[PDB]
Scaffold this active site. Structure first.
Site, short mmCIF file in Angstrom:
data_model
loop_
_atom_site.label_atom_id
_atom_site.label_comp_id
_atom_site.label_asym_id
_atom_site.label_seq_id
_atom_site.Cartn_x
_atom_site.Cartn_y
_atom_site.Cartn_z
N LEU A 27 0.83 -1.20 0.00
CA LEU A 27 0.00 0.00 0.00
C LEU A 27 0.87 1.26 0.00
O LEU A 27 0.35 2.38 -0.10
CB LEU A 27 -0.95 0.01 1.21
N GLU A 96 -4.27 2.27 11.09
CA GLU A 96 -5.57 2.11 10.45
C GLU A 96 -5.41 2.12 8.93
O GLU A 96 -4.87 3.06 8.36
CB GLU A 96 -6.55 3.19 10.91
N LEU A 98 -5.90 2.93 5.50
CA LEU A 98 -6.55 3.96 4.70
C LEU A 98 -6.53 3.55 3.24
O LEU A 98 -5.53 3.76 2.54
CB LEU A 98 -5.86 5.31 4.90
N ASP A 143 6.55 17.39 6.00
CA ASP A 143 6.40 16.56 4.80
C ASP A 143 4.95 16.49 4.32
O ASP A 143 4.49 15.46 3.84
CB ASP A 143 6.96 15.15 5.05
C1 793 Z 1 4.84 7.29 1.09
C2 793 Z 1 4.70 6.82 2.54
N1 793 Z 1 3.43 6.11 2.72
C3 793 Z 1 2.81 5.92 3.86
C4 793 Z 1 1.64 5.35 4.31
N2 793 Z 1 0.57 4.73 3.86
C5 793 Z 1 -0.63 4.26 4.46
C6 793 Z 1 -1.44 3.41 3.69
C7 793 Z 1 -2.62 2.92 4.23
N3 793 Z 1 -3.06 3.22 5.47
C8 793 Z 1 -2.28 4.04 6.21
C9 793 Z 1 -1.07 4.58 5.75
C10 793 Z 1 1.97 5.70 5.70
O1 793 Z 1 1.54 5.61 6.83
C11 793 Z 1 3.21 6.29 5.22
O2 793 Z 1 4.09 6.83 5.84
C12 793 Z 1 5.85 5.95 3.02
C13 793 Z 1 6.82 6.44 3.92
C14 793 Z 1 7.87 5.63 4.34
C15 793 Z 1 7.98 4.31 3.88
C16 793 Z 1 7.03 3.81 2.99
C17 793 Z 1 5.98 4.62 2.56
#
Ligand code: 793
EC number: 2.7.11.1
Length: 283
Positions: A27, A96, A98, A143
């Site tokens: 995800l 959670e 999303l 960020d």
């Molecule tokens: C782009 C970002 N993406 C991120 C997320 N996605 C979610 C998806 C579904 N539900 C909740 C959160 C985060 O939380 C979060 O940080 C990410 C950061 C560091 C490492 C990898 C990826």
């Protein structure tokens, strides 16, 4: 006597596989790790799993997120595991799930019947109080980008939540008459969240970023070109202008942002349609 208090951060040491079924579905991806979809063995419901290498920097970022999870517009942390993956130690953040997709994706994947000025303000206020909560407890997010704003469900009743605390930092180290300058030192920090906020509002209204492009940003030069911005009021543009100040010390504070009529009165702004959705289906 009434005494409101919540739990502290409990870093569980047992294997996550005991409590959760871990899928191979992604995800989220980054340089620091991956975000996977997981299921709670007991309740059988969907969750997100952020995997990070266990360094003191990460352990603090988790603590800040955990501290921030009490805010309705911030993705909530549920469990935190410290396990051995590969040979290295690592942190496992349970959040959670999303699955409502990115903010701009859902504005674009409307099969649009147009998208109103009022609805954009509702979006902004929600991201506003997400920053307001953070700033009120001495946390700068640093960020706030379109990628990190995700909706809960696919529902039209879904809540917008801010993710990714990989850049968050703590802004802290008779007399009710003293000045805030004399009350300890602080760098830029919080101001850059406000810039990001201004950027987001611009892309929200028209459909494109306001911005040697690294120079045009440092200049603070951006048009409000028609026939997109010909419909938006002077008040709104002046707010964006206040949020898009080159000088950090000149840029509007979050408290001022939330107080502003357009934001405070999310249900009084004219329901004039925008071209936003059409514009995104290009790049
Ligand atoms: C782009 C970002 N993406 C991120 C997320 N996605 C979610 C998806 C579904 N539900 C909740 C959160 C985060 O939380 C979060 O940080 C990410 C950061 C560091 C490492 C990898 C990826």
């Amino acid at each position: 006597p009434q005494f409101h208090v919540k739990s502290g951060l409990q870093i569980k040491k047992n294997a996550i596989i005991d409590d959760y079924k871990v899928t191979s579905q992604v995800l989220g991806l980054g340089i620091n790790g991956k975000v996977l979809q997981i299921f709670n063995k007991r309740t059988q419901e969907k969750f997100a799993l952020k995997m990070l290498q266990d360094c003191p920097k990460a352990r603090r970022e988790v603590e800040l997120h955990w501290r921030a999870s009490q805010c309705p517009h911030i993705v909530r942390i549920v469990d935190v595991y410290e396990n051995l993956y590969a040979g290295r130690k690592c942190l496992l953040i349970v959040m959670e799930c999303l699955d409502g997709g990115e903010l701009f994706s859902r504005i674009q994947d409307r099969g649009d019947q147009a998208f109103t000025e009022r609805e954009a303000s509702e979006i902004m206020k929600s991201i506003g109080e997400a920053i307001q909560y953070l700033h009120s407890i001495n946390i700068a997010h640093r960020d706030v980008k379109p990628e990190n704003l995700l909706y809960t469900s696919k529902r039209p009743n879904a809540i917008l939540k801010l993710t990714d605390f990989g850049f968050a930092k703590e802004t802290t180290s008779t007399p009710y008459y003293v000045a805030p300058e004399v009350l300890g030192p602080e760098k830029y920090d919080k101001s850059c969240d406000m810039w990001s906020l201004g950027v987001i509002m611009y892309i929200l209204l028209c459909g494109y970023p306001p911005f040697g492009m690294k120079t045009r940003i440092r200049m603070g030069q951006y048009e409000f070109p028609n026939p997109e911005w010909s419909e938006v009021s002077e008040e709104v543009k002046m707010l964006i202008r206040n949020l898009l100040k080159t000088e950090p010390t000149q840029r509007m504070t979050i408290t001022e942002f939330m107080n502003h009529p357009w934001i405070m009165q999310s249900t009084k702004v004219p329901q004039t349609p925008l071209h936003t959705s059409r514009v995104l289906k290009e790049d």
